Design a binder for these strands. Structure first.
Lengths: 549, 549, 48, 49, 98, 49, 49
DNA sequence: CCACCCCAACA
DNA sequence: CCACCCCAACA
DNA sequence: CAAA
DNA sequence: CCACCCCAACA
DNA sequence: CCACCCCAACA
DNA sequence: CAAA
DNA sequence: CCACCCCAACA
DNA sequence: CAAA
């Protein structure tokens, strides 16, 4: 029974240089995991209604009231980048390869360890002895039939360790349940009251209570037991490791230069606007670099800081990423935002239960939109636009001062384009199911790859209940022995990508590691410390042009 | 699972007498090893800067400031002689065989034991109970891809026991990391200050941080698990178990004797120097035994006690071994020097944390160079050399008294030869990689054999982390159970050598063991004691001529 | 890619004054052109 | 390393030089990081100018 | 004209001439003065003329990297001196037809 | 030169090389021979020279 | 042009080309000359070696 | 899976 | 079941 | 040993 | 031994 | 009837 | 050239 | 003798 | 259209 192992340990990254710059990247990782005993061996329908940030008047974007359901089952997510790659690899990848895809994924578990603890030592100070239970279990449920919801733990930064030589932990599986809410708007102090702040009883219509021990099979794993899945093949679209910058003013034949400089420090000049040949969609007589007809609408003006509503009511409305103009609208061009803990970054030697993030500002420049240059004219596009014939960024709307029109605008015409949300080395996600909606989003912001068909089945792990001498279920609270366990986990993630060309003349930007300054990109940041702490800093993947038009 | 063994125990030395004095020596050894729990399960980049031997003025040859990196991984080295042979064997070998080589090497591990200790006994005096954990691991990583550095533990006298019936220990793996230094010279008291004694921040250029749990595979060994490597074939040059003595004055046709003695006590005499037939490379008219043109330059005059510099700055500059003339320049003819502890010699019954060595003085006589007879003449090689026409060993240089010219000299002309650094029974090394430099040393001083191609892969061993009931990695310090283990280790080392001839008339020197005196070579030195202690004394291997020219 | 730590490379920075800054390469109003000798070997090799 | 730092800003320390195990090509009794026997001679000192 | 002084990368190889250093017989660490020869110790009776200017440590225990290419300018290939014996390398070019 | 060892001295050879317009004849280690009749000499000379 | 080929086993093949247009004038002399240079203006100094 | 102080009563 | 800092001395 |  | 909320990407 | 300090560059 |  | 920023819509 |  007990004695021999069940698995190996591969946290290697294998490269294969095929024919025609068709590389095959096979990443592995064997993380050792610790899983304790669920507090409850029940299913609970728990609700949260923070009436301490909900009973204010301005605190709307602070609504955290949701009706959740807890499962004694502990999940296992590895849908992250940091778990599959190293700082180097990525560098070699993003820095060399053009595009990239996602192939297979083969998860495996082995060398299961199960131990018990007996709080002893009353005839002294206090000591907890640890011994094994070579008869114990560890229910493993792999829900591929994707019957249950899809909870990408990477969501709430609840994944698997990034440091392959550091024991990590799982994420207790919990899923959403139908309730119903109604919350009204209100500013700072406003007068009167809010009126109603109601939850929602069972909507015996949208109710959807599941049970792992009902829908998915369980493979009671002991000690000498090995659980392993099959090779899940992916059917997703590639991802381009290249960034653009071709705006609308940088697409087509530049104006004809009738005059050229005569020596550095003397630019050229075009010819009489209203005498210049070309087309335009404006009824004036003079083509400009702004008027002139182009192929499409680079990037679109999305209302920033919306805030929509429904049955759980609020909720900010995302953005599809886009640079943060020379004005750093950073909140419009919906640049994101992350907050991770040690087990996913942080100065692995910091203090204060204070998270840490790194606002991601896309590269897909020439795409972004500056909100500090809005601008809209009227009928006869009179250039020297009067005032009553324009609407700038300062012109109030709704009678609210700091409330502009760019906050409502929405320019998503059948003449719109834009780049896909690029990956994010550490933290960042990988793949993500797809909303089972008749019609669907062009993309998900939450991940560069979206399986087109079913998706990987989630892998749920639980300790098996270890009982004592007593147990009459007609017992309010039942006694169980303190049982916990180790198992290793290994992962196969396969990708296949192409090798970039070199079409320019000018070198191009890359990722490097500088001396040790203070610059974001400086070793020390990565290599350990006297003791042995370790950071991971999200890096750029896409450093390199792509001549859009 | 548990019950049956996994390996044997062979610390035998097998001989095979092939056809044509082609012997095959297959040495084995099964050392039992003890490996404790790493203090840290982290990777640390530790530095040392002894500013207590560095802030002096003369103490330069005491700089011990290096930026090291510690690995939770414990290494296993057997690249020694003492581990592969006995006092007898060697005697039989070095004493009989002419030359010798190095063939295969097959390492193996088995009968893995893993136990836990529970400090108990507060209801008394204090007792630590020991029990087993038949579910525990012991990560074994064999880095052959020689990706990581090459740390011949035999370097810092950190190898495997020599006494096959005495449990030994491994060596925690640590490797060098790029820093940068600058230290200035200074004598005894000198005036002023040193100026700067600086370390070196990350040279985000020479940085090279590795991770075993990233580059090399790990074979999670349990109790009933056996890990074994393949037979590594060697591609190195043979080694001659013969010593020379043919100087430059002992290569060619001796002068013609025109007069012979008439009875013991009356030597012969040659004929008028400046009337003697022969050649010379000196413009004089009289051939001497010193002037006369020979085939080459036996041995070369290397600057002794150099002391060069660079980025970690100092460092003595080696020497290729050469006798220690009748003047025992012992420091020039770079005779070495060892310092070992019990587990590699020492009066296995001594006291005081005081090491012990044995200055090795090569045999490759007629090669060495005496620094007490230097000598250099001028243009018209006037024999009765005036003073202002010579430069002896007493003639100052640089304005420093005890600072001579022999300290700078360097006679390594395309007419130089010399013997390879001979082995050193106990202690001494065996094989050693090779500097991946476009151009390479003719030899390594540090070992008689240097694999011409890749080299054996190092074998790294670690305990697997045994966890407790608690573990939130967002935990400053994590709790782990005191876990340690035994495993045996066995070794196959194969060599093939030739049987010496007997071309002289006069017997020749050998290795023997005298009665019990006080002489270096006297039994008692080897055989145990009342109790049972044991020495190993490095012996001579090469006792026997070889007519060089 | 055997290490863990990224490693140095050659890149082209914004336009400063640093040796490695575009403008240095791309032509000029007129059309002149420099060539600046660059580094080839940016990357370790664990000697021993 | 017989002594390890306890937190960034406190390097480790080796053990008594003339008590340290290892080899050397110098006739003294205390191995250093400069004395200690290595494989070869990295780079060479050429007469400049 | 215009140039660019090439400073190899083959670090850990280079040698600092501002830390020379040579001791005598019994390698007494606290080296007296008359028992050393530093970078400031004259030679030939010339002040700014040191011993590092004459030194030559090219023992059968020497290694070093090949002169690396030099993108622009720099050479490519170069014949080989028809000498019975030949240089280990040419500084003037990374590749030397054999 | 003049080096030493166990039979002690001995000049240290030279690999041949011209004798510059200054005829260093002893540096550029030009050699040197001395033969008798049965290998040259004015097969009709005198003096054991 | 500069053509790249990604073979099997990271064995790339780089084929570089270049077609430079060249201008070549008429040699001043259609003779062979043995010319010498002896700068006795940097040679007749004392330090200028 | 014990043969004449090793491999090897060899296979 | 150790080959030249990866897959892979590949099969 | 970088090709084969 | 993971395919589109079951058996069952069935065999 | 000369091969790498023996038989023996074996046959 | 020590294996083959 | 034009195919998806190279060789090469390869042959 | 990135595989096939």
């Amino acid at each position: 029974g007990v004695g021999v192992s069940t698995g190996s340990y591969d946290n290697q990254t294998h490269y294969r240089f095929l024919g025609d710059g068709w590389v095959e990247i096979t990443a592995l990782a064997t993380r050792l995991v610790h899983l304790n005993m669920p507090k409850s061996e029940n299913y609970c329908r728990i609700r949260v209604h923070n009436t301490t940030d909900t009973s204010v008047k301005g605190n709307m974007a602070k609504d955290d009231a949701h009706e959740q359901i807890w499962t004694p089952w502990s999940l296992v997510d590895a849908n992250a980048w940091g778990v599959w790659l190293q700082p180097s690899d990525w560098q070699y990848i993003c820095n060399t390869m053009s595009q990239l895809n996602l192939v297979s994924l083969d998860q495996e578990i082995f060398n299961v360890v199960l131990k018990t603890v007996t709080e002893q030592d009353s005839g002294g100070q206090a000591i907890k002895i640890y011994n094994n239970d070579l008869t114990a279990c560890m229910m493993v449920a792999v829900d591929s039939n994707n019957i249950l919801p899809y909870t990408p733990a990477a969501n709430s930064m609840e994944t698997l360790g990034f440091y392959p030589w550091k024991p990590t932990i799982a994420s207790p599986y919990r899923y959403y349940f139908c309730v119903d809410r109604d919350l009204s708007v209100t500013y700072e102090n406003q007068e009167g009251t809010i009126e109603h702040n109601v939850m929602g009883t069972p909507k015996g219509m949208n109710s959807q209570f599941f049970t792992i021990e009902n829908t998915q099979q369980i493979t009671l794993l002991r000690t000498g037991d090995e659980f392993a899945t099959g090779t899940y093949y992916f059917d997703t679209n590639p991802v381009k490791l290249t960034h653009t910058w071709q705006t609308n003013r940088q697409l087509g034949q530049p104006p004809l230069l009738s005059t050229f400089p005569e020596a550095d420090t003397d630019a050229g000049t075009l010819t009489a606007q209203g005498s210049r040949h070309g087309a335009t969609q404006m009824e004036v007589n003079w083509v400009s670099e702004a008027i002139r007809t182009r192929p499409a609408q680079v990037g679109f003006c999305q209302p920033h800081n919306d805030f929509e509503a429904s049955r759980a009511g609020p909720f900010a409305a995302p953005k599809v990423p886009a640079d943060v103009t020379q004005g750093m609208d950073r909140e419009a061009n919906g640049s994101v935002r992350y907050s991770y803990g040690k087990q996913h970054g942080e100065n692995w030697a910091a203090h204060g239960p204070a998270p840490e993030r790194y606002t991601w500002d896309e590269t897909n420049f020439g795409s972004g939109r500056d909100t500090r240059d809005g601008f809209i004219q009227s009928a006869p596009l009179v250039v020297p636009p009067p005032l009553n014939g324009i609407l700038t960024n300062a012109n109030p709307i709704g009678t609210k001062n700091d409330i502009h029109f760019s906050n409502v605008f929405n320019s998503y015409g059948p003449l719109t384009t834009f780049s896909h949300p690029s990956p994010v080395y550490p933290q960042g996600q990988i793949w993500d199911k797809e909303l089972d909606l008749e019609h669907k989003p062009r993309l998900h912001i939450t991940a560069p790859f979206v399986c087109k068909n079913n998706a990987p089945g989630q892998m749920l792990v639980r300790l098996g209940p270890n009982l004592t001498d007593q147990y009459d279920p007609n017992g309010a609270t039942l006694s169980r022995i303190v049982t916990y366990g180790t198992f290793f986990w290994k992962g196969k993630l396969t990708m296949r990508a192409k090798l970039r060309a070199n079409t320019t003349w000018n070198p191009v930007y890359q990722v490097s590691v500088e001396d040790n300054g203070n610059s974001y990109m400086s070793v020390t940041k990565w290599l350990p410390t006297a003791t042995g702490n370790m950071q991971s800093v999200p890096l750029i993947t896409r450093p390199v042009a792509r001549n859009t038009y």
